[PDB]
Amino acid sequence: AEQFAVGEIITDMAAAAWKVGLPIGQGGFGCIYLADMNSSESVGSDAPCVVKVEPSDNGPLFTELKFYQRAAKPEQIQKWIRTRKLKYLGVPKYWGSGLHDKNGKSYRFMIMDRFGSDLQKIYEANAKRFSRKTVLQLSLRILDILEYIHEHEYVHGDIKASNLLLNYKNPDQVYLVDYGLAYRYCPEGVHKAYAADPKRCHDGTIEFTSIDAHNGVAPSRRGDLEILGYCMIQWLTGHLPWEDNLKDPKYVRDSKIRYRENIASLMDKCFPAANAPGEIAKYMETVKLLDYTEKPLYENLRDILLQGLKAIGSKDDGKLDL
Numbered sequence: 549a550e551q552f553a554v555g556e557i558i559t560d561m562a563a564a565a566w567k568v569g570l571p572i573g574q575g576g577f578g579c580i581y582l583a584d585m586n587s588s589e590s591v592g593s594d595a596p597c598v599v600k601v602e603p604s605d606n607g608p609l610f611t612e613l614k615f616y617q618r619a620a621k622p623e624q625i626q627k628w629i630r631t632r633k634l635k636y637l638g639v640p641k642y643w644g645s646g647l648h649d650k651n652g653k654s655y656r657f658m659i660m661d662r663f664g665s666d667l668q669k670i671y672e673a674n675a676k677r678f679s680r681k682t683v684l685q686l687s688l689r690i691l692d693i694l695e696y697i698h699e700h701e702y703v704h705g706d707i708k709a710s711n712l713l714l715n716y717k718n719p720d721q722v723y724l725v726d727y728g729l730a731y732r733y734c735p736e737g738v739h740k741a742y743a744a745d746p747k748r749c750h751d752g753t754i755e756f757t758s759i760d761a762h763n764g765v766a767p768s769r770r771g772d773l774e775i776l777g778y779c780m781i782q783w784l785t786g787h788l789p790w791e792d793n794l795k796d797p798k799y800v801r802d803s804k805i806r807y808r809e810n811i812a813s814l815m816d817k818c819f820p821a822a823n824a825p826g827e828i829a830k831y832m833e834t835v836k837l838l839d840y841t842e843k844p845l846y847e848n849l850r851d852i853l854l855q856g857l858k859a860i861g862s863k864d865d866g867k868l869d870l
């Protein structure tokens with residue numbers, strides 16, 4: 549059911565005018581089309597925006613829109629980039645939203661930045677390996693993103709390569725996308741208790757998700773950091789220990805619990821020899837020390853990863869090396 553007439557002009561709630569182009573990536577990512585500001589030109593394949601459109605009763609698009617309106621306004625993002633002295637911040641820019649009726653059904657739409665490739669495609673094209681340099685540079689920037697969203701009351705719960713996209717015009721800038729299943733863990737500064745939330749039915753991506761999520765509790769900050777830990781190992785080695793049993797969540801949980809209790813055994817399992825990168829172990833030990841409601845020391849985590857860069861004769865020069 550086509551939601552748009554190709555080339556139509558749509559007006560968001562702030563009265564800004566946009567033009568709709570063709571769907572992205574051969575329709576493999578659902579109802580997301582290229583978009584640009586209204587003009588006499590039609591929308592090309594190098595369009596700088598996309599429009600996401602879903603039925604108005606779609607829960608995830610509403611959640612995602614509230615995240616962007618609350619936490620990702622220009623002033624908030626630019627103020628943070630300035631005050632933290634960052635090169636950039638990988639939270640996608642939200643441009644506008646509205647309601648669109650068609651054929652007697654009601655839809656919601658959101659205009660966002662258009663990106664280049666996801667990291668999963670690049671990872672697979674590299675025979676499922678990223679270099680130590682790449683993984684550390686990706687993870688430093690993801691720590692910047694997580695600190696930002698955490699400080700604005702949200703956790704992501706689903707960090708992975710397919711949710712990490714490159715700036716269309718700059719392959720050294722990575723962005724974390726998909727807030728449809730994001731969770732507001734700290735509304736108005738009050739942390740959610742350590743329990744299930746009936747409103748939330750999402751457990752994340754089984755191979756990467758947190759022990760908290762496996763235990764049926766709502767995601768919190770430590771969980772996001774834990775997810776990133778599992779990603780780092782997957783990216784460095786091509787594997788995780790529990791990957792042959794992902795249809796059995798009890799098995800996945802059991803194995804994560806055991807490897808959290810004995811991080812040296814995780815390093816032995818995942819890396820050759822006594823050839824584990826020490827920063828990965830230290831990262832995981834530091835995350836292990838976090839209580840459910842505890843604020844992470846994000847700078848201490850970044851410093852741990854920076855020691856990895858010094859160990860390989862490099863520095864944080866922002867080069868992803870993809």
Ligand SMILES: C#CCN1C(=O)[C@@H](C)N(CCC(C)C)c2nc(Nc3cc(F)c(O)c(F)c3)ncc21
Pocket residue numbers: 572573577580598600640641660661662663664665666711713725726727
């Ligand atoms: C053309 C092109 C490249 N290209 C893709 O091949 C896939 C990987 N995707 C979909 C990812 C979704 C499924 C997360 C993209 N997405 C965007 N922009 C975007 C920004 C956001 F902030 C969103 O929330 C959002 F849905 C989409 N821009 C380019 C892409």
